[PDB]
Amino acid sequence: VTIVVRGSNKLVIEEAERSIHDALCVIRCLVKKRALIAGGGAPEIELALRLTEYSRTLSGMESYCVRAFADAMEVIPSTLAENAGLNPISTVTELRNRHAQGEKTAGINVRKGGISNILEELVVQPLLVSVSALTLATETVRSILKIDDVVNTR
Amino acid sequence: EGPLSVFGDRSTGETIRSQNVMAAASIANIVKSSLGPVGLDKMLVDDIGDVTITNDGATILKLLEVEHPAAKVLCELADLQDKEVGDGTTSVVIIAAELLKNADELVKQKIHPTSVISGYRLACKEAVRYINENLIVNTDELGRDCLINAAKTSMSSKIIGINGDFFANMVVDAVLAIKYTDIRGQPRYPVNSVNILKAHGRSQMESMLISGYALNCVVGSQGMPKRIVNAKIACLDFSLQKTKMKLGVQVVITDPEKLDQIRQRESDITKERIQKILATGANVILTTGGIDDMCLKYFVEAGAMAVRRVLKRDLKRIAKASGATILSTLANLEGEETFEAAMLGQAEEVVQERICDDELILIKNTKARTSASIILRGANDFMCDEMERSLHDALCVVKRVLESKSVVPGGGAVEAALSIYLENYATSMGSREQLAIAEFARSLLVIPNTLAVNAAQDSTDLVAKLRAFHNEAQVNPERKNLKWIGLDLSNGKPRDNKQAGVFEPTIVKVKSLKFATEAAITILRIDDLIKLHPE
Amino acid sequence: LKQMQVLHPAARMLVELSKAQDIEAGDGTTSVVIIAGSLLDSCTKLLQKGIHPTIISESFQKALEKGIEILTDMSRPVELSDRETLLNSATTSLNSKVVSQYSSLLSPMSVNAVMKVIDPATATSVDLRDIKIVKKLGGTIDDCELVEGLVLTQ
Amino acid sequence: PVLVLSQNTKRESGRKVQSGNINAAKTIADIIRTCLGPKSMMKMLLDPMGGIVMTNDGNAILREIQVQHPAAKSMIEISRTQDEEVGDGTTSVIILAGEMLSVAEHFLEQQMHPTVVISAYRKALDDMISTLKKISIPVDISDSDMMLNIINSSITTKAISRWSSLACNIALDAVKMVQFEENGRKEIDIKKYARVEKIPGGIIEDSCVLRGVMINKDVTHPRMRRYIKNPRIVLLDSSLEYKKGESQTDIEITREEDFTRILQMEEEYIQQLCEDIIQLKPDVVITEKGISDLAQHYLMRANITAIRRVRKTDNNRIARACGARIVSRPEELREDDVGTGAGLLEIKKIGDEYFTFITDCKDPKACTILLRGASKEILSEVERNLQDAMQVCRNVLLDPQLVPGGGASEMAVAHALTEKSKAMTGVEQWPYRAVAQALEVIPRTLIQNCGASTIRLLTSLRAKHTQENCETWGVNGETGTLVDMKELGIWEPLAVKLQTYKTAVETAVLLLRIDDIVSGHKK
Ligand SMILES: Nc1ncnc2c1ncn2[C@@H]1O[C@H](COP(=O)(O)OP(=O)(O)O)[C@@H](O)[C@H]1O
Ligand SMILES: Nc1ncnc2c1ncn2[C@@H]1O[C@H](COP(=O)(O)OP(=O)(O)O)[C@@H](O)[C@H]1O
Ligand SMILES: Nc1ncnc2c1ncn2[C@@H]1O[C@H](COP(=O)(O)OP(=O)(O)O)[C@@H](O)[C@H]1O
Ligand SMILES: [Mg+2]
Ligand SMILES: [Mg+2]
Ligand SMILES: [Mg+2]
């Protein structure tokens, strides 16, 4: 099949082509793994909550590190709250409070300007995207932690 | 900086936004003085001393050197408007710049750019929908009057302004002479098939329309005739020179007695071709290739005209008009070469005319189809070039009017009506898109303001009068006919422009609005610039 | 990340990270870099407290192993015969770009393409070289179209 | 860094641009206005190659000047367009354009928009044309005395007036010998068949027009005759020698006899070629290419005279004069292509150089003009004057109408416009009169060059033209009095006046529409 892309400028044509490629790759990801998950920052906040709970179980220095991992997952919701002109502290606190007492599909609604169920707004994404992102990020950090020198060569 | 070793320069935040806006504004300020029947022209001089006189937005923006991207976007916008439609290349830049300025005024307040973008899109869609109520069907009017008025309106503000009637009649006749007979689902009018030639000399009122075709070429030799009454025309696409063998073939001689008969053959083969052409009664032969001096003698003796180095497109137009057939070779569906008399065109007269110390060729009254050409006279070369550029606009406008049977008033009636309607319609949204729609409506109002300012009139009072009249038109249905009162610039008062005869195709307005909105949206989204250092 | 020219050797790895995601998913190229940066930021306090980098790496691996399980437990199965879910996923992936306003035109097309190239009964992956994108200047973004045939430029 | 948007382009706008354009145009007009009328003085100019131009023609002055302001370039261009279109009047057009542009800033400085001035000028041009056509006078072209009078009136201003009765005759004859009708009804007076040859020395009174042509060539071999009474002439476009083909020809020989054999065949070729000429029994052979020595041998054996390497233009003129036509293959030479209209072929020496004259033609349609004189500069000026005279003759032959000179036409048109303008209302009344009063700069200048009182003569002439039938009164440019052009006899063609007025008005209209300038924009 062929797609013909039209536009009034070269730059907008390039951006349109990139966007169409994004959508095509998303559908391909959905084909690869028949699984769906809720967007809008819900996975990150739930991950932070559950890892904070899990940290209490562990004992020793390891516990501290796990807690740090959890605190590094709330950057995505906070950013989503900042870009929309919302208050990040209140928004993230409300997200955590609502995720800690039941329903796990809460998220940031920019149309409503607040916090609400995310499936009612019909924003979803594949699971492979999140899983691959987390795995690659963790592997890259582990690789970076192994370095202790810089040498200038020819 | 410190972080992000980039060996470039980075700008972020309102700063870059403001900078971008200023760039756009500058471009508008270059052309704002060339809009309307009162605006004047521009002179451009390069580094070596060539002078170009023009008031065409596309030409000015193409000849300038620009390097800020936010201005190159507008330059390409003007080029696209020229390609798609062919008129209104100055108004679209003004509209886009004003939209960008009014949107930045809101974005300086804590209004998110996405809301402005959505409001702009909604306003553009609704304005395009509403314009289809201001239409006039040209078949309802008398067709010739509508066409003449459209052409004369397009021609105003150009060097051929006061001569609007003469050139309007010429343009309408030339366009009607080119109408082609398609499948008959819809007729088509292929403009730029009408040749335009320039020759300085007599006054511009001595420009002529030729019912036929005009070639900027001269006869091959001074011994040939220079006028044929009943013309039989053969069009060729190959050179008539003494034959040479191709790269693969070579001559090796071991017996001297066989040399001479070879050297004759090279001079004979081509002759045997020419006779085949001349045996069918052909008088005029046109060739895109060259003709040797040895071959010109056959035409000279036979009493015929031969023209060499004819452009391909001119040959295509001549062959299509006169009914002839273009031949790249004489070979047929058998092994031999023949020339038949059924592939000859017929013309009622062929002349070589003299114009201001040079010569050119006229082919008059072709029989297969009608064709046209225009010869433009002026004081010098700059004037003639400006007239050609002006005439192209009128030809394109008349083509658009004929293809799409609808016209729209001019002078600023559309802008005032749309501003009133969109300002009224913005109340129903009741959101942050209301502000964006109101700014769209207020930005549409820059055209009548510029028109009044260029005429050195009171812009504020005149625009207020227009808005009051159109407001009284939108309510109180018994006065619906006030939606056509435009603007009169030679006296400074409104006047009914539909009866006054100021018309324009609706496609101009539609495409200008769409393209301007797209450009404003695509520029309104940038919040960070990174400029890398040269290598 | 590719169009800039990052000079630091560490920052020259993050770009590669994004590349990897583009190969695997085609979406979430920004989120992976954000997450990597946040983890490396959180590592500083642990380094100051006297933790050894090896312990940090092991704890990050443990946290990743728990997070994958949590995310998998979040998910929800989908079937390719439901076009509404595919449309929702595509329009979610498409509403962050300049062409969001044209989503009601670009969302179905994409889906259509992916359903005209694969065999849904046995599809295990998609070849995107079977879909050709042609860029043509002129018009507006509202003029993109889907051709079930052949398009040539010469 | 240096944030820029247009890369060092220089922009100017406002009233300063209009004032600068008008000032530049007036400055251009100021250089020339001393060269109008029968009392003009010459100017000498130096060209970049070291020569000298001592001239009086307006175009010859303007085209030798380098300038930067675009308005001056426009003025020079209109000068050269006037020169090309009609050939005369390249001084009055510049002065008229300058005056018409000068009388406009008075309205521009009184907050009046340029478009109003443009409309007024365009309205006035049509009335100028109609009034010019109203006072025209027809001329009979079969009266030679009247034609000589017109040509003389055209050349009383230039430097060859001291020999006017000579030059006039020359000009007339030349034109009458080139008027030519051919297939169809197309008549032409093409001036590429009237060649001017200059030979320094002698005296100017020996200049003449030959019934024939004249070339700078000599016989190929000394034994050829240099004096033939009634020659038959064939013209060739090819070379009488053996040349190579172009089909990548090679020869491989293995036998003793082949080499010499090949060298013989070439000669045999030449022989048959020469025979194909001798079959027509001619006396003169003219070719544009070379001639081999063996061909000269054969032709001399056949008692022929040969010339080599004549230019294509000279061959075309000889063909048109003697009555032959050019042939490129001798095998296709007929009797109809042999020219028998000549009456003498002679070869003389003119100051250590050989020249060939083909003269005494029965009815030639091409001619040559032989000029003698003191040096090169004088002959160049005489050539320019002869060009002016012949162009005037052609113009009068293509359009037999006449209008009075000396300023009668300008004052008549000005009076007509002034009388017509009092029937109009509105602002456009005032620019409309201005152009009318801009037509009085032609008589005034004349008076200033004669050395008379312009303030009294102009008002006397204006009062004289107010009467009912005085449309032919003007200024005697040699004494400084008022005289009727009927008795003085200064008449000029209508085409020159029409072109002058049209070009001047259109140049003013073009220059009134500029509003800003942009420079240094890299193409
Ligand atoms: N006779 C007239 N009266 C009032 N307005 C006019 C008249 N003729 C043209 N216009 C206006 O001039 C504008 C077009 O200006 P123009 O110089 O042709 O540039 P462009 O059409 O390329 O934008 C149109 O908006 C039209 O309304
Ligand atoms: N309508 C929406 N409301 C709230 N969040 C959204 C919406 N659409 C997309 N998002 C969020 O935007 C995030 C990423 O968007 P995007 O800018 O494309 O980053 P990336 O390219 O890394 O995916 C996703 O996590 C998703 O949850
Ligand atoms: N004897 C004369 N008396 C008065 N005016 C004359 C006389 N001869 C020529 N003129 C005028 O001189 C003008 C010609 O100007 P001239 O110096 O020849 O250059 P140009 O012909 O290029 O203007 C004509 O308008 C003509 O009326
Ligand atoms: Mg226009
Ligand atoms: Mg994304
Ligand atoms: Mg003169």
Please render the helix and strand layout as text.
The structure is cut from a larger assembly and holds 2 copies of chain A (154 residues), 1 copy of chain B (535 residues) and 1 copy of chain D (523 residues).
Chain A: E1 2-7, H1 10-32, E2 35-38, H2 42-57, H3 61-71, H4 75-83, H5 88-99, E3 106-109, E4 114-117, E5 124-126, H6 127-144
Antiparallel strand pairs in A: 2-5, 3-4
Helix pairs in contact in A: 2-3, 2-5, 4-5
Chain B: E1 8-12, H1 14-31, E2 41-45, E3 51-54, H2 57-63, H3 69-84, H4 91-108, H5 113-131, H6 143-155, H7 164-176, E4 195-198, E5 208-210, E6 212-215, E7 227-228, E8 231-236, E9 251-253, H8 259-278, E10 284-287, H9 293-302, E11 305-307, H10 312-322, E12 345-355, E13 358-366, E14 373-376, H11 381-403, E15 407-409, H12 413-425, H13 433-443, H14 446-454, H15 459-474, H16 497-500, E16 503-505, H17 506-523, E17 528-532
Parallel strand pairs in B: 4-14, 8-10, 10-11
Antiparallel strand pairs in B: 1-17, 2-3, 5-14, 6-13, 7-12, 8-12, 12-13, 15-16
Chain D: E1 10-13, H1 15-32, E2 43-46, E3 52-55, H2 58-62, H3 70-85, H4 92-102, H5 105-108, H6 114-134, E4 137-138, H7 144-155, H8 164-178, E5 180-181, E6 187-188, E7 194-200, E8 208-210, E9 213-215, E10 227-228, E11 233-236, E12 249-251, H9 256-278, E13 284-287, H10 293-301, E14 305-307, H11 312-322, E15 326-327, E16 344-349, E17 354-359, E18 367-373, H12 376-398, E19 401-404, H13 408-421, H14 429-437, H15 441-450, H16 454-465, E20 473-476, E21 481-484, H17 485-488, E22 491-493, H18 494-511, E23 514-519
Parallel strand pairs in D: 7-18, 11-13, 11-15, 13-14
Antiparallel strand pairs in D: 1-23, 2-3, 4-19, 5-6, 8-18, 9-17, 10-16, 16-17, 19-22, 20-21
The complex binds adenosine-5'-diphosphate (3 copies) and magnesium ion (3 copies).
EC number (chain D): 3.6.1.-
Disulfide bonds (chain D): 361-367
Enzyme class (chain D): hydrolase
